[PDB]
Design an enzyme around this catalytic site. Structure first.
Site, mmCIF file in Angstrom:
data_model
loop_
_atom_site.group_PDB
_atom_site.id
_atom_site.type_symbol
_atom_site.label_atom_id
_atom_site.label_comp_id
_atom_site.label_asym_id
_atom_site.label_seq_id
_atom_site.Cartn_x
_atom_site.Cartn_y
_atom_site.Cartn_z
ATOM 1 N N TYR A 55 0.785 -1.247 0.000
ATOM 2 C CA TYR A 55 0.000 0.000 0.000
ATOM 3 C C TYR A 55 0.819 1.301 0.000
ATOM 4 C CZ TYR A 55 -4.353 -2.638 1.002
ATOM 5 O OH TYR A 55 -5.421 -3.506 0.964
ATOM 6 N N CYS A 211 -14.072 -0.195 -3.396
ATOM 7 C CA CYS A 211 -13.403 0.935 -4.033
ATOM 8 C C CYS A 211 -14.438 2.033 -4.242
ATOM 9 C CB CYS A 211 -12.799 0.520 -5.380
ATOM 10 S SG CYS A 211 -11.633 1.742 -6.091
ATOM 11 N N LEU A 212 -14.677 2.804 -3.184
ATOM 12 C CA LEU A 212 -15.658 3.878 -3.186
ATOM 13 C C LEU A 212 -15.153 5.213 -3.723
ATOM 14 C CD1 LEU A 212 -18.086 2.491 -2.252
ATOM 15 C CD2 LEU A 212 -17.972 3.713 -0.061
ATOM 16 N N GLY A 215 -14.395 6.773 -7.658
ATOM 17 C CA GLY A 215 -15.156 7.444 -8.695
ATOM 18 C C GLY A 215 -15.584 6.483 -9.785
ATOM 19 N N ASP A 220 -18.239 5.805 -16.278
ATOM 20 C CA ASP A 220 -18.391 4.404 -16.654
ATOM 21 C C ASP A 220 -19.893 4.159 -16.624
ATOM 22 O OD1 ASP A 220 -18.075 1.601 -17.078
ATOM 23 O OD2 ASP A 220 -18.182 1.266 -14.912
ATOM 24 N N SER A 263 -11.253 7.023 3.478
ATOM 25 C CA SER A 263 -11.479 8.458 3.351
ATOM 26 C C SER A 263 -10.493 9.209 4.219
ATOM 27 C CB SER A 263 -12.883 8.819 3.792
ATOM 28 O OG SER A 263 -12.936 8.811 5.204
ATOM 29 N N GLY A 264 -10.357 10.501 3.965
ATOM 30 C CA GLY A 264 -9.421 11.283 4.742
ATOM 31 C C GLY A 264 -10.077 12.375 5.547
#
EC number: 1.-.-.-
Lengths: 297, 297, 297
Positions: A55, A211-212, A215, A220, A263-264
């Protein structure tokens, strides 16, 4: 707070929602900004953190560590999860992306995690992926070593098929604590190939990642129908966001997966944990599900 | 010599590499030429021989036998493997290719093998293929008969899926000694569908055959990329031939398959056994693998 | 008569052939016409009847019941099978076709069956389909309730994959008595995906349904080759009809499935049961099979 859950028979207690530091670098965050980001999610109830070998080009563990160094007392309040078994081209030794689930390497990465994370122990260690060259005996021998020293206290796997999970499991004297897998409307194979039934059957709860923030919508149109459906269901449940409807969709699975959050911002993290209060109806689960697919049954 | 290996829990000891007489007729070899071909591979270390029902239009067993007749003392030095369960159009009774795994027929073919091979016993007998009409009880009843007379001492299967292998296995008081299957860069399904994990899990070693001398290259550019990759890796390992790189690719599998050799020249047979000294790197295994496929992971 | 068969270890005795009332409404039959239709198939030997939740827009159970009311003594002579777990748009509560395998609902439908069927008990109850949201504990808790009152005496499933069947089974103190599935030349997936091997292995006999009277021929030339093959084999066996050749094709499966009959005429019902006397050869089974597919092996 966030619900607490024992991930498996002889396993540890985790928080239903785990903080995943997959994209810690992307957040362009500083060490003192992370010690405070952590505290805030620790206070929300999210106390289990997900880390991994490769990672961030082998940088995320180190980064998290620097921050753990600023508030050494933050360890006791959390549960650390890390992985090994994957070899990315982010390193010059790996000209190609291959797997490495050999004894010394598993011990290597493990011990390297302790150092990078600035901790004397990992709560859980997972074999990153199933390697066609994996030797259950060899891995199980690696786990026995790491455990013998208290360096690692619980072992697991990620992205293993029922057959692989059973293979490695037939060699360990302890119970695999989880199978961290990908689960979402966009990725539902695991819902029918036996993976989640094995988990529910053995009472092992899956750490689920979706995998949010990637995007994977609006760019897509293949999943526009799912976009449109996650949108209406969202109003019906009067939820904070469609992302919140997604987290609740996963939470509804009978296997009781532990959704991983990427998320951050504590606010979005808060919103994520808020998915434990949406009363999704079976009909709303299937309607979401079906739009992602395109058919009934 | 060639390494010796116990194929399964209560199973027999075999030589890591087995001589397969699938194409014995193609070799236009004579009886005295075979008794000497045999001795030479017996001396190399290859002491396990693979035969089957339908191989060569029901002629190969007979041929091998004539040769075994010239040097009766050659039996003790070898281990014979034969099969039954397949019905080819090479016979007028079989207007169509179907399976026959009924009691009397399994006993029939078995006893016919002893005669054709000129031996009082077969070391191992395999059900050639899984028949949709297979009745584990019936087959298991056949095995009990053949075993009761010392005619057959170990039983196995070939091309069985984990589910079929488990079905028949739930009926036998003895352990299926192997699942002879096809494994190679060109055919890797068995690497992910559970077949090899079941084997490794039960500690049953697979007899692996790879249609090598068939020429499945140079005349099917679909695998030119694999041709080109097996070629470079070959120089890297400074191997005798790309065929040798292939035999070593199979040998690396954690299930420890016993590669079956299909050739009519002791020199190529020697070269095949020489694959036990190539130090293939994980990276070289994956690179080969990947070229056959066309993608990573 | 029709052969009797114990569907599973601690299970009940059924008649090899079961009468299925899937299309009872289509028969535009009256209550006194059904009491006499029943008697006639009861006298033929067919004593097991197949009913389900959603069959006929929630009307078939009721209809059958009215008839059972005319000859109350007909119960003892039969074995009733019903299902639950499916939610069709035939109801306004179900805007979409979803599954409902929650406790109260399983108890609900069950008890509703007793009423509609005019009986104090169901011999067997099946979970209609596998629900991605199914919780083996919840279902197993439902079964324990229904059983505790003698309302339902045996439990089963329908259209479950080996993995799902094993999941629910790991929660019940009693043995799942069957897995009612679709089996026929036109639908042979279950022949290779493990479903029938699991059944044979556990000695649980499958109730098999084949959408026969549907006319899935003559109006889908995709299976003309199977039409032509079922036709010749029919003359070879000098059978009453190609439908009879089909029923015998299923009967030959090693899992010993119990073919379900969907017809409204005792004569065709008679003809169906007559399939127990056709001596189909392995070669004739494969030839039929192969024509449906299009290739050998």
């Amino acid at each position: 707070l966030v619900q607490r859950i024992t991930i498996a028979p002889q396993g540890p207690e985790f928080s239903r929602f785990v903080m995943g530091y997959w994209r810690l670098m992307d957040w362009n965050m500083s060490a003192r900004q992370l010690v405070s980001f952590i505290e805030e999610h620790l206070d929300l109830g999210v106390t289990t953190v997900d880390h991994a070998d490769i990672y961030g080009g082998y940088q995320c563990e180190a980064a998290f560590g620097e921050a753990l160094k600023l508030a050494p007392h933050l360890r006791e309040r959390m549960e650390i999860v890390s992985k090994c078994g994957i070899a990315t081209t982010a390193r010059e030794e790996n000209v190609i992306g291959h797997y490495i689930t050999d004894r010394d390497h598993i011990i290597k990465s493990a011990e390297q995690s302790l150092i990078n994370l600035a901790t004397d122990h990992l709560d859980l260690l997972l074999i990153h992926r199933p390697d066609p060259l994996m030797d259950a005996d060899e891995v199980a021998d690696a786990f026995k070593h790491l455990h013998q020293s208290g360096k690692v206290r619980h072992f697991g796997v990620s992205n293993f098929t029922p057959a692989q999970f059973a293979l490695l499991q037939s060699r360990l004297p302890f119970t695999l604590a989880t199978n961290q897998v990908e689960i979402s409307p966009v990725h539902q194979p695991l819902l029918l190939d036996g993976t989640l039934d094995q988990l529910q059957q053995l009472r092992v709860r899956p750490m689920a990642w979706s995998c949010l923030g990637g995007g994977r919508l609006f760019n897509d149109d293949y999943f526009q129908p799912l976009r449109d459906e996650l949108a209406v269901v969202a109003e019906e449940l009067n939820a904070g966001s469609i992302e919140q409807v997604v987290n609740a969709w996963v939470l509804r699975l009978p296997s009781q997966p532990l959704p991983i959050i990427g998320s951050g911002k504590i606010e979005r993290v808060r919103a994520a944990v808020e998915a434990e209060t949406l009363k999704m109806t079976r009909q709303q689960w299937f309607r979401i599900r079906k739009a992602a697919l395109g058919y009934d049954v």
